Each structure stands twice: as structure tokens, then as C-alpha cells.
Amino acid sequence: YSAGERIIDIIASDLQTTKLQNQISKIQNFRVYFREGRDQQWKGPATL
Amino acid sequence: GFLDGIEKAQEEHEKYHNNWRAMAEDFQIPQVVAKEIVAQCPKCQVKGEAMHGQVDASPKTWQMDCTHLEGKVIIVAVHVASGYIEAEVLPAETGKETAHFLLKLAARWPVKHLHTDNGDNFTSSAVQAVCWWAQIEHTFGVPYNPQSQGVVESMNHQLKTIITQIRDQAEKIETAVQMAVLIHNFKRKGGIGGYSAGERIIDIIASDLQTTKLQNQISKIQNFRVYFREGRDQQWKGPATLIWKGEGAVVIQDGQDLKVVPRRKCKIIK
Amino acid sequence: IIASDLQTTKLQNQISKIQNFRVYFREGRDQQWKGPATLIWKGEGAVVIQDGQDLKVVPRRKCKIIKDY
Amino acid sequence: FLDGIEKAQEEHEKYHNNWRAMAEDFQIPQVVAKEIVAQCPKCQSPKTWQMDCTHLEGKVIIVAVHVASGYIEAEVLPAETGKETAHFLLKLAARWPVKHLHTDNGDNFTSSAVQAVCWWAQIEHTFGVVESMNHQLKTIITQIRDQAEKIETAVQMAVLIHNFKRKGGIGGYSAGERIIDIIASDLQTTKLQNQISKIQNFRVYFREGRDQQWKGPATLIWKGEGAVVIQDGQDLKVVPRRKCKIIKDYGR
Amino acid sequence: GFLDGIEKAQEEHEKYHNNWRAMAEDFQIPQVVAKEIVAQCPKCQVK
DNA sequence: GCTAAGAAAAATCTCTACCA
DNA sequence: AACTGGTAGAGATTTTTCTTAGC
DNA sequence: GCTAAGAAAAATCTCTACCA
DNA sequence: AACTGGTAGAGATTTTTCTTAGC
Numbered sequence: 001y002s003a004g005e006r007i008i009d010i011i012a013s014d015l016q017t018t019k020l021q022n023q024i025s026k027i028q029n030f031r032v033y034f035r036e037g038r039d040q041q042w043k044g045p046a047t048l
Numbered sequence: 049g050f051l052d053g054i055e056k057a058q059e060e061h062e063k064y065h066n067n068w069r070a071m072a073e074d075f076q077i078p079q080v081v082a083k084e085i086v087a088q089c090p091k092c093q094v095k096g097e098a099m100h101g102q103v104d105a106s107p108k109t110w111q112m113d114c115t116h117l118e119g120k121v122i123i124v125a126v127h128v129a130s131g132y133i134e135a136e137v138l139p140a141e142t143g144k145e146t147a148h149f150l151l152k153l154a155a156r157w158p159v160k161h162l163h164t165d166n167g168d169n170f171t172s173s174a175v176q177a178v179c180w181w182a183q184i185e186h187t188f189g190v191p192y193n194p195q196s197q198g199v200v201e202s203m204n205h206q207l208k209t210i211i212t213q214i215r216d217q218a219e220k221i222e223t224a225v226q227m228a229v230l231i232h233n234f235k236r237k238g239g240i241g242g243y244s245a246g247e248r249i250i251d252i253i254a255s256d257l258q259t260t261k262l263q264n265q266i267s268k269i270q271n272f273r274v275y276f277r278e279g280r281d282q283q284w285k286g287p288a289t290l291i292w293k294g295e296g297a298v299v300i301q302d303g304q305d306l307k308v309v310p311r312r313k314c315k316i317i318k
Numbered sequence: 319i320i321a322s323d324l325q326t327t328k329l330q331n332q333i334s335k336i337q338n339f340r341v342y343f344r345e346g347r348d349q350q351w352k353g354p355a356t357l358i359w360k361g362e363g364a365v366v367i368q369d370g371q372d373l374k375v376v377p378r379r380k381c382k383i384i385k386d387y
Numbered sequence: 388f389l390d391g392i393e394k395a396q397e398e399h400e401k402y403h404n405n406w407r408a409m410a411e412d413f414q415i416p417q418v419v420a421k422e423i424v425a426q427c428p429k430c431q432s433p434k435t436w437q438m439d440c441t442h443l444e445g446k447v448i449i450v451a452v453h454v455a456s457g458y459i460e461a462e463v464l465p466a467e468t469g470k471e472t473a474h475f476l477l478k479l480a481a482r483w484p485v486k487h488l489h490t491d492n493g494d495n496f497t498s499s500a501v502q503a504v505c506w507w508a509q510i511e512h513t514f515g516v517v518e519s520m521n522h523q524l525k526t527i528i529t530q531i532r533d534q535a536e537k538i539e540t541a542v543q544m545a546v547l548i549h550n551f552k553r554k555g556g557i558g559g560y561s562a563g564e565r566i567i568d569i570i571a572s573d574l575q576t577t578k579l580q581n582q583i584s585k586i587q588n589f590r591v592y593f594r595e596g597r598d599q600q601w602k603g604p605a606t607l608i609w610k611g612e613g614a615v616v617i618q619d620g621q622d623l624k625v626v627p628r629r630k631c632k633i634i635k636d637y638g639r
Numbered sequence: 640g641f642l643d644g645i646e647k648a649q650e651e652h653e654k655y656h657n658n659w660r661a662m663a664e665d666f667q668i669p670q671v672v673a674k675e676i677v678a679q680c681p682k683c684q685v686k
Numbered sequence: 687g688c689t690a691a692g693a694a695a696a697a698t699c700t701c702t703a704c705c706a
Numbered sequence: 707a708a709c710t711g712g713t714a715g716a717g718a719t720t721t722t723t724c725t726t727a728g729c
Numbered sequence: 730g731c732t733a734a735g736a737a738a739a740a741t742c743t744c745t746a747c748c749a
Numbered sequence: 750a751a752c753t754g755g756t757a758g759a760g761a762t763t764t765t766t767c768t769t770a771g772c
């Protein structure tokens with residue numbers, strides 16, 4: 001590989017690590033209203 | 049004993065059609081035998097099992113119906129997960145106008161699944177051609193069962209009450225229909241999030257897109273394969289993708305199926 | 319020869335007691351109760367039944383399923 | 388907490404960040420970050436539409452465009468009077484939140500029917516994007532013309548291809564994804580502003596360390612389970628709940 | 640239905656004097672009616 | 687200065703008619 | 707073999723919030 | 730001889746359609 | 750100022766009864 005391919009690969013890998021730790025919390029900040037068996041009311045806000 | 053009582057109970061039910069408590073008390077037979085005597089009769093068995101089902105409420109499902117008001121034909125479509133309404137007045141109840149209404153709806157919003165009854169305008173070649181071109185899956189209800197399309201008939205009721213509330217502010221019926229659609233979509237609040245129907249459809253579609261992009265970025269940098277032991281026989285199943293590890297159980301994906309397995313029956317491999 | 323006959327009768331006994339149900343259902347515009355039929359599939363909310371070599375979908379609120387003891 | 392608030396104030400003093408970025412990075416609540424942006428002197432549209440009429444094959448096509456995203460709603464009118472224009476405007480206002488309308492000085496746009504619809508639906512009308520969108524839509528209409536029989540079918544098929552099949556711009560999105568993202572961001576801002584005003588109708592008397600006298604009336608910003616963020620003397624600071632007394636303020 | 644099984648189990652016990660668990664498993668009738676078929680026979684005794 | 691009684695105001699729960 | 711009742715308002719009961727009397 | 734597991738059988742609870 | 754929904758059956762869940770293996 002040349003120099004530009006190496007610098008792009010290295011900084012992209014570092015970004016992927018740190019943003020992984022932030023992105024999991026971002027996906028767990030949503031709220032789900034679900035329905036169980038043979039009860040017709042929507043249950044409260046569980047976490048996705 | 050009661051064996052002659054069983055024969056007498058069969059003759060008595062053949063004449064009078066007793067229920068099981070009458071036969072079990074008059075002939076002194078046990079209740080399992082009397083329940084069998086009633087259950088082997090065809091003139092009885094006229095009663096259902098007393099439950100209700102639940103309809104499909106995916107974030108791209110729409111239901112549709114036609115209603116009548118003052119000699120006109122209104123056609124109503126509802127987004128099921130939010131309660132969002134589109135409605136129009138048709139010159140006739142043919143299949144050409146229903147196909148044009150469905151094409152305008154698909155040009156405005158993302159439609160992937162349509163649910164209707166078995167009316168003549170919905171079981172039509174024009175509607176079938178539009179669904180083929182726009183890639184919509186059309187499903188029909190069980191015939192003469194309006195509970196299959198419960199959301200759009202509930203919205204027929206709500207639309208008619210708003211139209212009688214604001215009727216003396218318009219001249220024609222078509223103006224009153226569009227004013228009722230505006231009042232329902234933006235001026236009435238309460239429900240899941242304290243929202244109106246317009247705020248709820250914006251929240252549902254935006255959260256759908258954002259959560260797919262987030263878990264694409266999460267899953268493209270994963271590791272940690274998981275070997276787990278489940279089944280009626282204590283076997284070993286193949287390569288599973290670890291998704292989340294919690295204090296008590298783990299979440300694995302195997303064959304695009306999500307499973308929650310406790311921590312004793314699994315091992316994580318880097 | 320005799321042992322294979324015993325094992326075959328045992329497996330056929332289990333298969334005969336799995337899914338031999340009768341269904342009395344209610345359908346049509348004038349919803350009358352119609353005769354017995356054979357249960358094919360049972361989901362939550364609706365069933366698929368075979369009646370007179372015709373397939374029908376009935377909701378579970380308009381049908382009664384009779385088992386065997 | 389207070390370390391995060393001081394770091395966010397220093398970072399905003401250098402680079403003037405926005406409140407969503409500061410709330411995500413320095414791990415503080417969103418009302419505190421919005422207050423940090425609101426105290427800066429150097430830091431102080433999702434509902435505007437444009438309408439136009441055009442001609443094609445002897446028919447009148449009326450096009451409305453959402454300006455911040457490029458989203459299109461079109462129709463085929465039987466004539467070019469003001470009653471059909473008023474009915475098209477009433478349908479658009481029934482389906483989307485419309486607050487500001489921009490048109491040219493045509494005849495049917497300057498009419499009593501359009502004026503009555505704008506009065507009832509509370510729209511601000513201004514007389515003077517749509518031409519570029521008309522040209523792009525007409526290239527699509529001549530591209531997919533032989534798949535349909537009438538002109539209304541071809542118009543609605545071109546609206547679907549424009550809204551959901553052509554992708555571009557910065558991130559590579561269609562117009563429908565951009566309009567839903569824009570309106571959702573505005574909805575988030577208005578809900579947070581309602582919470583901010585409801586919280587800021589209070590007032591706080593606090594007791595500083597190694598003093599037995601209560602201090603001045605500081606305005607409440609955030610109230611937690613064990614911490615309280617107050618504004619006093621153009622300064623933000625964090626006082627625990629055991630040295631605070633929160634009272635209603637009537638200072639309208 | 641097991642009422643025809645009740646009639647066939649009565650004929651079978653009149654011939655061979657089966658026990659009640661055997662008749663209940665072979666003819667698919669409940670256990671109360673099988674014990675009653677044994678109990679009405681003068682030569683037999685349910686045990 | 688601190689607590690608590692008492693009332694106002696908001697939140698949650700159960701149940702009904704209507705949709706050809 | 708691959709389908710299905712739901713929505714919104716009227717009271718009733720319980721919980722949270724706000725002011726003031728008393729030690 | 731006495732206990733208890735396990736299954737059969739009976740009793741109680743919730744919910745549905747129909748009555749112009 | 751003096752009126753008004755109810756009945757009966759289908760499953761589901763819980764409790765009582767009966768036989769037999771084991772110490």
C-alpha cells in the first residue's frame with residue numbers, strides 16, 4: 001500500500017472503536033411500546 | 049352403578065337435548081361422561097370460543113375502506129401505527145378512482161403493505177396493476193368480518209363526528225372533509241406520547257430510519273463469536289453472532305434469528 | 319416381524335392422536351353454523367379448515383374445535 | 388458534573404459548539420447545554436412552501452415544493468381558477484404543517500377563495516426553486532411517459548420517482564428522508580423549549596459552604612435527584628439538594 | 640367419542656375378564672367407567 | 687426554622703357506543 | 707399451512723404539589 | 730404403616746354474541 | 750321527584766380427590 005491508503009485505514013479504525021462505545025448507548029435511548037398475549041393494552045416504555 | 053344410566057341419558061338427550069349438568073344430576077353419571085354425550089351431538093355446538101385477535105401494526109402498514117355520507121362516497125386510508133388519516137371524495141366507487149387514490153398515496157408516503165376488505169373496487173385489475181408497479185403487498189380480510197380492519201372503521205366513526213362539528217362553516221361536503229382531516233391530524237392530542245397523529249407519524253418513520261443506520265454501523269465492527277448449548281438434547285449449534293451481553297443472559301443471533309440464552313450455557317470466543 | 323408390527327402400531331397410535339380434530343364453523347353473509355370439517359392450520363386469531371375439498375379461513379371467534387379424549 | 392459544565396463552557400468559548408453536540412460529548416443534560424448556548428452574545432425554514440402552475444399537453448399541472456428538502460406534491464387541475472387552487476392549498480395544509488406560502492403574482496393566487504383558505508388555516512402568504520423542480524419533473528415525465536395511458540398517472544408516477552428513487556446531496560438521501568429528518572428536528576426543539584419554560588418558573592434559595600445565611604434568589608435550570616444547577620450572577624453552579632430551598636416565583 | 644368403546648369394553652370383559660387399566664388403555668375410555676365395568680362383574684374385584 | 691394537615695391539581699384506571 | 711377489533715371520552719380513585727397553622 | 734408425588738376430575742373465573 | 754342489561758356456554762387456571770411407589 002501507498003502512504004494515503006495507510007493513513008486512511010489507520011484513522012478509520014481508530015474512529016470505529018471510539019464511536020462504537022458511543023453508538024450502543026445511542027441505540028438504547030429509544031422507547032418501545034409492546035403487546036403481550038391476549039391483553040389489548042399497550043404496555044409501557046421498555047428499552048430497545 | 050351407572051351404565052344403564054348412560055344408556056338412558058343417551059336416549060333422553062336424543063329427545064330433549066339436555067345440557068351436561070341436567071344429565072349428570074338426573075342420571076347420577078360422572079361429569080366427563082355427560083360432557084361427552086353433549087359433545088357428540090351435531091344439533092348442539094353453536095357457540096364460539098370467546099376471544100379476540102390482534103391486527104398487524106408494522107411501521108409501513110396502511111388500511112383502507114369506503115364510507116357514505118349525504119349520498120357521496122368517501123374513501124379513507126389510515127396509517128395503523130400512528131393513526132394518520134388521508135381521505136377524499138370520489139365521483140364513483142369504481143376501481144379506476146381507487147387505483148388513482150392509491151397511486152397518490154404511494155407517491156406521498158412509503159407504503160409497503162395494504163389491508164382491505166373484499167369490496168369490488170379493491171379486488172380489481174387496476175388496483176392490482178398499481179400494487180405491482182409500486183411494489184405493495186395487498187392482503188384481504190376474512191369475508192364478512194369487519195373486525196379484521198378495526199382501525200379504519202374506528203376512524204370512519206371519528207371522521208363523521210368531526211364533520212358534524214364543523215358542518216356549518218363550509219358550503220360543500222368536500223371542503224368539510226378536508227377540514228375534518230386537518231382537525232384530526234393536527235388539532236387533537238393524546239395517545240402514546242401525548243402526540244397528535246402528525247407528530248406521531250414523523251416520530252415513527254424517523255426513528256425507524258435512524259435505528260437501522262445505527263445498528264449497521266454497530267454490526268460492521270463486531271467480533272466475539274459465541275458457541276452455545278440448547279435444545280431438548282444437549283447438542284451444540286454452529287457459529288452465532290454475539291449482539292449484547294447482559295448481567296444474567298446474553299443475546300445471540302443464529303440464522304437471522306434472535307435468541308436470549310443464559311450465561312451458563314454459552315462461551316464467548318475471540 | 320411381530321416386533322416391527324408393534325412399533326408401527328405405537329407410532330401410528332401417536333400420529334392418530336396428534337391432530338384428529340373436528341371443526342364447526344360459522345360463515346357466509348347469513349352466518350349459519352355448518353357441519354364438521356378438518357383442521358389444517360391453527361394460528362392465533364384464525365384457523366384454516368378443509369371442508370368438502372374446499373379451503374376456508376375462519377376466525378377463532380366463529381369456530382369451535384372438538385378434540386378427542 | 389461540574390467538571391463537564393466547565394469543560395463545555397470553555398469549549399463553547401473557543402469554538403461555539405451547538406447544544407446537541409455539547410450534550411452528547413460532555414455528558415450533561417440538554418437543558419443545561421441549551422442554557423450555555425443561550426448565554427452567548429455571538430449566537431443570537433422547516434415550514435415554508437412555494438407554489439407554481441405550469442402547462443403540459445394542454446393540461447394544467449400545479450406543483451408545490453418544500454424548500455429546505457426539495458419535496459414535491461403535484462396535481463392536475465381541470466381549470467386555472469381560484470377555487471381549484473384553494474382546494475389544492477386546503478389539501479396540502481391538511482396533510483403537512485404549512486405556515487408560510489410563497490407564490491408569484493398570478494390571478495388565481497390573488498383571489499378571495501385563496502384568501503379565505505389562508506385565513507382559516509392560518510398561513511402567511513407572500514407574493515414575489517419551483518422552476519428548477521418543474522424542469523426536473525418534466526424530464527422525468529417525458530422519460531416514463533410510455534408506461535402510462537393518461538397524463539395524471541404519469542404525473543403521479545414521476546412524483547414517486549422524484550421523492551423516493553433519486554438520491555443525492557451530502558449524505559446520499561432522497562427527498563422524503565430529508566423532509567422527515569427536518570420536521571423531526573424541529574419537533575424535538577419545541578418540546579425541549581416547553582420543558583425549559585416550565586422549569587424556569589421557579590426560584591432557589593441556597594446556603595453556601597461554611598455560612599449560615601441564605602444567599603440570593605438564583606434561577607433554577609435543572610433539578611436532579613441529588614444535584615441542582617442554578618444561575619446566579621451570570622454564573623452557573625451546582626448545589627446539592629440538602630442546602631437548597633425551591634419556591635415558586637411570580638415575576639411576570 | 641368413547642361410548643362405543645364403553646360397549647365394546649363391556650363385551651370384552653364378558654369374555655376375557657380384563658383388568659381396568661388394560662381396558663382404559665386399549666379402548667380409550669376414562670378410568671371411572673373402566674373401574675365401574677370391573678365393579679359390576681360378580682366374579683371380579685378391582686385391585 | 688421545621689413539620690405536617692388539608693386542599694387543589696394532575697395522573698391513572700375502568701368501561702361505554704359506534705364504525706354499512 | 708401464514709390470520710387476527712379499535713379509538714377516544716366520562717367519571718372514579720389515587721398520587722403529587724402548594725400554602726399555612728402550629729411548636 | 731405412613732408420606733408424598735403425580736395424575737385425574739371437579740370447581741371457579743373471565744369473556745363473548747344475541748335479543749326487532 | 751321514584752328509574753335502571755342479561756343469560757349461558759367455551760376455555761383457562763386453580764383446587765380437590767385417588768392410586769401407588771418408596772422408606
Ligand SMILES: O=C(NCc1c(F)cc(F)cc1F)c1cn2c(c(O)c1=O)C(=O)N1[C@H]3CC[C@H](C3)O[C@@H]1C2
Nearest residue numbers: 113114165166167168192194195201202705706711
Ligand atoms: O358492518 C360493517 N361495519 C360495522 C362494524 C364495524 F365497522 C366493525 C365492527 F367490529 C362491527 C361492525 F358491525 C361493514 C360491513 N360491510 C362493509 C364494511 O366496510 C363495513 O364497515 C363492506 O365494505 N362490505 C363490502 C365487502 C362485501 C360487501 C361490501 O359487504 C361488506 C359489508
Ligand SMILES: [Cl-]
Nearest residue numbers: 165166191192
Ligand atoms: Cl368483506
Ligand SMILES: [Mg+2]
Nearest residue numbers: 113114165167
Ligand atoms: Mg368496506
Ligand SMILES: [Mg+2]
Nearest residue numbers: 113114194201
Ligand atoms: Mg367499513
Ligand SMILES: [Zn+2]
Nearest residue numbers: 065089091092
Ligand atoms: Zn344435543
Ligand SMILES: [Zn+2]
Nearest residue numbers: 403427429430
Ligand atoms: Zn456562542
Ligand SMILES: [Zn+2]
Nearest residue numbers: 656680682683
Ligand atoms: Zn369379570
